[PDB]
């Protein structure tokens, strides 16, 4: 364990290195958080990156003679060296004193190290629920809602995504207090009930590990941590504390005005109107009348966009204002033929959803224009 050494084909290293460098990046703090932990033992090389809140581990099987041990090495420099070597290269790595040597061909790189003993670990924990699902289903759930997470709200429980198991369904919820997205998908297993908040940076990391086609995703949820296994990777994150809002109480109660329109026509009309909306406040005005929607936008310069669209609507006329970016985010996430908007009045939220599917639902709160 004192003299780590391994030799591995470049192509078995590149994707693991790229993946484990995900939690890394900006804001130097502890020096060793810019490093990857390398551990050789019993036929396996493990590579780990962490930002203290979450960690990503990749396992690479070692075919060739190796000696056990561990060290840490600058992540980006090690990846850039491996990637810069020619296709098919064999990469021989060994600790020499306080340096890590990387050799291939007549190329030699001697990298600085920091001790493996200094590499931070997440505290140990106990999984309460576990389930396995296709990557495509998790990717659905996250893409349907991720845009509605808050970024830096003082309501820190909003800077993340709720993952909820209920019956046979896995559900995601995201909201920033101005808009909410919820999506649920069947999992094919009866699950205990759990509701946990994954921090927004963990959502992004989870989601970048779903490159794999058909390798399934195994999820374990504890009281304070979540872990996802895909292929040879294991991702673990802390959870966020707090009582996340109940989407069931956020959905508009009995909206009485039901508008249906083509999703692409509606999206393009809002996108053009947005050009002449206020650059900061983004307000657009919707006027609904018999089978018609009018969208208007004005800015401090007194420029004005107006779009009129034929829609399906029978009901009282009303006017309502929205941040057009929030509406465009919903329409971009729907990707369907027809959308349904369900309205109540000018001061109340609206529900937006695919006219043909109820798997996802969106709620947007209006603006007083």
């Amino acid at each position: 364990a004192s003299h780590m050494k391994f030799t591995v084909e470049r192509e078995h290293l590149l994707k693991p290195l790229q993946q484990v460098s995900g939690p890394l990046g900006g804001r130097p703090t502890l020096p060793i958080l810019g490093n990857l932990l390398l551990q050789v033992a019993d036929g396996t090389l493990s590579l780990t990156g962490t930002d203290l809140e979450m960690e990503m581990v990749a396992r690479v099987a070692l075919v060739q003679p190796h000696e056990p041990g561990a060290t840490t090495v600058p992540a980006r420099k090690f990846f850039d060296i491996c990637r810069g070597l020619p296709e098919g290269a064999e990469i021989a790595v060994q600790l020499e004193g306080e340096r890590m040597l990387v050799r291939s061909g007549r190329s030699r790189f001697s990298l600085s190290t920091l001790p493996a003993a200094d590499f931070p670990n997440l505290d140990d924990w106990q999984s309460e629920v576990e389930f396995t699902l296709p990557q495509a289903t998790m990717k659905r759930l996250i893409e349907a809602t991720q845009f509605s997470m808050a970024h830096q709200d003082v309501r820190y429980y909003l800077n993340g995504m709720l993952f909820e198991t209920e019956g046979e369904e896995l559900r995601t919820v995201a909201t920033d207090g101005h808009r909410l997205a919820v999506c649920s998908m069947p999992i094919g297993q009866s699950l205990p009930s759990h509701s946990v908040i994954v921090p927004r940076k963990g959502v992004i990391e989870l989601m970048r590990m779903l490159d794999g086609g058909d390798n399934p995703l195994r999820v374990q949820i504890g009281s304070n941590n979540i872990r996802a296994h895909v292929g040879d990777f294991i991702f673990t994150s802390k959870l966020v504390d707090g009582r996340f809002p109940d989407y069931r109480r956020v959905l508009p109660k009995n909206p009485d005005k039901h508008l249906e329109a083509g999703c692409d026509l509606l999206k393009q009309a809002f996108a053009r109107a947005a050009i002449l909306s206020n650059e900061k406040f983004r307000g657009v005005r919707l006027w609904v009348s018999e089978n018609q929607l009018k969208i208007t936008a004005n800015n401090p310069e007194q420029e004005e966009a107006e779009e009129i669209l034929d829609v399906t609507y029978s009901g009282a006329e009303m006017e309502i204002g929205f941040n057009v970016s929030y509406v465009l985010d919903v329409l971009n996430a729907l990707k369907c033929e027809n959308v349904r908007m369900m309205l109540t009045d000018s001061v109340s939220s609206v529900q937006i959803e695919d006219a043909a599917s109820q798997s996802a639902a969106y709620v947007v709160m209006p603006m007083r224009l």
Partner: peptide, 5 residues
């Protein structure tokens, strides 16, 4: 802009 909660 109004809030949901």
């Amino acid at each position: 802009q109004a809030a949901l909660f």
